[PDB]
CSV table of C-alpha atoms in Angstrom, one decimal:
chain,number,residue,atom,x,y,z
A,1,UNK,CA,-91.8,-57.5,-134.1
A,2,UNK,CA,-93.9,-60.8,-135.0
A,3,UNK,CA,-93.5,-63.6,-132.4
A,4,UNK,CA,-94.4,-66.5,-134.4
A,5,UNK,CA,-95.2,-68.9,-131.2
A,6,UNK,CA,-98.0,-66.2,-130.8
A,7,UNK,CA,-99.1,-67.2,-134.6
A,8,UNK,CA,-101.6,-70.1,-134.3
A,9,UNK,CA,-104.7,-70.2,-132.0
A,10,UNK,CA,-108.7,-70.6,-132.0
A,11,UNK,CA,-109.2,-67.1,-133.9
A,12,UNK,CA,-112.2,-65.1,-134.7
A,13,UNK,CA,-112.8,-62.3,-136.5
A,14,UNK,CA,-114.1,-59.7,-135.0
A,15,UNK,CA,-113.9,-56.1,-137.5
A,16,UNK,CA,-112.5,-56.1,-141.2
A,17,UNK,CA,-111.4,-52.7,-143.1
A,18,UNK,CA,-111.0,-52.2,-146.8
A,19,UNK,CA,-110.4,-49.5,-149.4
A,20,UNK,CA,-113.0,-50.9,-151.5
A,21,UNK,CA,-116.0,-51.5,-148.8
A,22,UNK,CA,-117.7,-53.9,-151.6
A,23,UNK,CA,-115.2,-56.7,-150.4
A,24,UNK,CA,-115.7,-57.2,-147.7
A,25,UNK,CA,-119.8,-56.3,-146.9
A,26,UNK,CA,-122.2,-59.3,-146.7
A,27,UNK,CA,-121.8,-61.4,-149.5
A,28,UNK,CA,-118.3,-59.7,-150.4
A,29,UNK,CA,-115.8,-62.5,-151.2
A,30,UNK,CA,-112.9,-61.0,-148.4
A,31,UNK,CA,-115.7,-61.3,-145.9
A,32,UNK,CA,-114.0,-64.6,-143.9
A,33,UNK,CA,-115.2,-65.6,-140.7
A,34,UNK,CA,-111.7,-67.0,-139.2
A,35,UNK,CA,-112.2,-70.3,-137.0
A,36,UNK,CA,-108.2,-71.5,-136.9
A,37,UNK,CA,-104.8,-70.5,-137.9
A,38,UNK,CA,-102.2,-73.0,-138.0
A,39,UNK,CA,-98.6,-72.4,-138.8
A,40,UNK,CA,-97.1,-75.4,-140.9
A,41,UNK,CA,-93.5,-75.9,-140.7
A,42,UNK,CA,-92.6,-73.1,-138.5
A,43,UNK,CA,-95.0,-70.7,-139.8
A,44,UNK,CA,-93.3,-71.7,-143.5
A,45,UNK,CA,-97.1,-72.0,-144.7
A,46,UNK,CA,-100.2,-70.8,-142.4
A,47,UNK,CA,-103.1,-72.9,-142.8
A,48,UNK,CA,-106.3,-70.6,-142.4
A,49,UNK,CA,-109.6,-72.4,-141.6
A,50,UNK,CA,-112.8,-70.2,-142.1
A,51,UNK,CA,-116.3,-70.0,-143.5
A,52,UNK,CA,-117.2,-68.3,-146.6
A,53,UNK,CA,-121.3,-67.1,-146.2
A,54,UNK,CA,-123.2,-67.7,-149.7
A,55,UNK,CA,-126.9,-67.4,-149.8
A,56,UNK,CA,-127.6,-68.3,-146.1
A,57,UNK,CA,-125.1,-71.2,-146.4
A,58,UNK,CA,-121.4,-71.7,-144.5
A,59,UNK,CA,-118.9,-72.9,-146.3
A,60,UNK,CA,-116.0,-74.1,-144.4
A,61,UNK,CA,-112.9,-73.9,-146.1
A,62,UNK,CA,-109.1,-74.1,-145.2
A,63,UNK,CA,-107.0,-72.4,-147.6
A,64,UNK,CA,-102.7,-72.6,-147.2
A,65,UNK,CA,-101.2,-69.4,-147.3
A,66,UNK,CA,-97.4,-70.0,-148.2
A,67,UNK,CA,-94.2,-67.6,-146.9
A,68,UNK,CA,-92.9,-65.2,-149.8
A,69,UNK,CA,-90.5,-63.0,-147.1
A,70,UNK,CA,-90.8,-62.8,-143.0
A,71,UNK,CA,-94.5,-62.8,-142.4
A,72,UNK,CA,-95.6,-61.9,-145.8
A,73,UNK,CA,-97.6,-64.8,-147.3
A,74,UNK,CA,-99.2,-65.3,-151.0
A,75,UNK,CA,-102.6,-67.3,-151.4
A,76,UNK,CA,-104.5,-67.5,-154.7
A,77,UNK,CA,-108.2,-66.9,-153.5
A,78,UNK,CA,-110.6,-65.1,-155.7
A,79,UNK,CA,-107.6,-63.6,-156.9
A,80,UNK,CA,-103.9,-63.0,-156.3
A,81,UNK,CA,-103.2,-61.9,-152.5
A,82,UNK,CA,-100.6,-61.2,-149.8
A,83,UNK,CA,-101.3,-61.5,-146.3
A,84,UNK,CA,-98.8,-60.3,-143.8
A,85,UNK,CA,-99.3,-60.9,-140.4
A,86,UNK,CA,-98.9,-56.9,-138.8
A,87,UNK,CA,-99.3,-57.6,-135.3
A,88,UNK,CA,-99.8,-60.2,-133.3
A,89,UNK,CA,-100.4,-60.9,-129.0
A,90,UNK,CA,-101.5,-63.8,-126.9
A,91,UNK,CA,-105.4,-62.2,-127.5
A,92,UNK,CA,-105.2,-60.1,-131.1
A,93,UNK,CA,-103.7,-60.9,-134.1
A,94,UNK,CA,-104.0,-58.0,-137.4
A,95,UNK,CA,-103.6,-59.1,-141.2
A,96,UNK,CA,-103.2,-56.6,-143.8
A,97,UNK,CA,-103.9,-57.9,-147.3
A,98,UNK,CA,-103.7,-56.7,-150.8
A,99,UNK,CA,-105.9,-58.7,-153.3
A,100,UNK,CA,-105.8,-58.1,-156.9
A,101,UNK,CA,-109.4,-59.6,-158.6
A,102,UNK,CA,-108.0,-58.8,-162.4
A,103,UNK,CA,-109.9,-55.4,-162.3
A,104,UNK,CA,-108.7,-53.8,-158.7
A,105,UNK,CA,-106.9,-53.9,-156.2
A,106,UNK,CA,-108.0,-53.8,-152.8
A,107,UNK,CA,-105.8,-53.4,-149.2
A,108,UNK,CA,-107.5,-54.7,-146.0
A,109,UNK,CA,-107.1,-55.4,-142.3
A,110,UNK,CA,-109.1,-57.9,-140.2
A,111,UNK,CA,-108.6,-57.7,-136.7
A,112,UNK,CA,-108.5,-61.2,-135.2
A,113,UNK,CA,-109.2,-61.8,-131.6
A,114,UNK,CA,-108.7,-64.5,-128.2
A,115,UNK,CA,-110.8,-64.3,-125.0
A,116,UNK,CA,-112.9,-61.3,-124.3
A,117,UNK,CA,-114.0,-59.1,-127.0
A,118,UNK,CA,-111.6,-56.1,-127.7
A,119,UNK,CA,-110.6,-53.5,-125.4
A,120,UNK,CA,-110.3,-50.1,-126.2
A,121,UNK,CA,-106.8,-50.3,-126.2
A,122,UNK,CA,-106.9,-52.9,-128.8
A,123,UNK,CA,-109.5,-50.8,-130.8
A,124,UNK,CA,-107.1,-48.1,-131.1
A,125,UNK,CA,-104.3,-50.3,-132.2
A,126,UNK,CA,-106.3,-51.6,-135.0
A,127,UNK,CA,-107.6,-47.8,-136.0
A,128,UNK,CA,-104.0,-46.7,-136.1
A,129,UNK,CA,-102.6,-50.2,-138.1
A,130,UNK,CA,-105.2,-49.8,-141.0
A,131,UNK,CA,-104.0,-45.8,-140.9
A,132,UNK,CA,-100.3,-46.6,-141.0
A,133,UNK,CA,-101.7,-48.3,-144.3
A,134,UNK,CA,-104.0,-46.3,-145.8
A,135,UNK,CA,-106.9,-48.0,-145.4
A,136,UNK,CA,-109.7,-46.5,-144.3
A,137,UNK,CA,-111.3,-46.4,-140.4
A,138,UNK,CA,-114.5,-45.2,-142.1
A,139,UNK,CA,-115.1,-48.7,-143.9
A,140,UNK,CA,-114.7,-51.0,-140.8
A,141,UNK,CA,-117.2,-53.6,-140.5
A,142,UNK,CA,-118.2,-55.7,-137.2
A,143,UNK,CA,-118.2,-59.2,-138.8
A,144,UNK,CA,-118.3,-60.9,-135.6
A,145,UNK,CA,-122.1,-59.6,-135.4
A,146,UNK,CA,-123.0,-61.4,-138.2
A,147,UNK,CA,-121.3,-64.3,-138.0
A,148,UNK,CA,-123.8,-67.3,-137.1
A,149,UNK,CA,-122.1,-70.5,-138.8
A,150,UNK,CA,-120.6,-73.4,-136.5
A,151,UNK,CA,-118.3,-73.1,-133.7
């Protein structure tokens, strides 16, 4: 169950998962850096602030998400997605997303995060929501290790 009061906050990422690993690697065009979620009209549309990394530059977008059903959103960016909002706390929030890029299409988590860094209880929540899904624990990556543009 998704308390949407829980919704918007100061988020960073700190892992992302994906079935194709490409996506989502350095210089991978799912690789976000979260800064803000902010739900617009009672979580009707999410407004998602993060940077992009290109070529040693941060590019800080917000892109509008917009509610299909419940907390399943559509965005169009680089590609057609959904984003549903899995599972959500006062310290972790869990996306899954299915992009299709014309060619493939990819399912991924990113595992959001308040406060301290994760606990191991949150660690093995987010192992066991990309499994539920069928994407793989073997292509995590740690983007919060890498992620050096403005606070």
């Amino acid at each position: 169950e998704i308390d949407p009061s829980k919704i918007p906050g100061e988020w960073r990422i700190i892992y992302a998962a994906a079935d194709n690993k490409d996506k989502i690697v350095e210089g991978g065009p799912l690789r976000n850096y979260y800064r803000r979620i902010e739900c617009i009209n009672d979580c009707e549309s999410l407004s998602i602030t993060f940077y992009l990394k290109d070529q040693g530059t941060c590019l800080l977008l917000t892109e509008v998400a917009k509610r299909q059903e419940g907390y399943v959103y559509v965005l169009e960016f680089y590609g057609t997605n959904t984003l549903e909002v899995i599972h959500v706390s006062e310290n972790m929030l869990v996306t899954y997303v299915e992009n299709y890029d014309g060619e493939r299409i990819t399912k991924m988590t990113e595992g959001l995060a308040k406060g301290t860094s994760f606990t191991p209880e949150e660690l093995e929540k987010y192992q066991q929501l990309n499994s539920e899904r069928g994407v793989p624990n073997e292509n995590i990556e740690n983007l919060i290790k890498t992620d050096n543009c403005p606070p």
